[PDB]
Homo-oligomer: A and B are copies of this chain.
Amino acid sequence: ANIYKGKITRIEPSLEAAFVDYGAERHGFLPLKEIAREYFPARPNIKDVLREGQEVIVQIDKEERGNKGAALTTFISLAGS
């Protein structure tokens, strides 16, 4: 159940993170530390790594809570593997 194709909506350099529409109303939060090198450009900051509109494969590490979007990661948990 816990896997999504997310679109980067907004990049926030002051948080070194991006907001992601993964199909919830609340955008998810994807910090630079949670971005796999497959997404890195051909010590980058978030602005160098992601761009609005691009899609990422994410899972939820922390559900929506209080006023916060889900904390997302691109490091997908896969059994056996």
Binding site for B on A (CB under 8 A): 1-5, 7-8, 23, 39, 51, 53-57, 76, 78-81
CB distance from A30 to the nearest CB of B (A): 14
Q: A1-B4, A5-B1 known; A80 and B57 CB under 8 Å?
A: no
CB distance A2 to B2 under 8 Å? no
Q: How far is the CB of A59 from chain B (nearest CB, A)?
A: 9
Q: What B residues does A80 contact at CB under 8 A? A: 8, 51, 53-55
For the complex of A and B, the 3 pairs showing the least CB-CB separation, nearest first, are: A54-B80, A55-B78, A55-B79
Contact status A57-B78, CB under 8 Å: yes
Is there contact, CB below 8 Å, between B57 and A79?
no
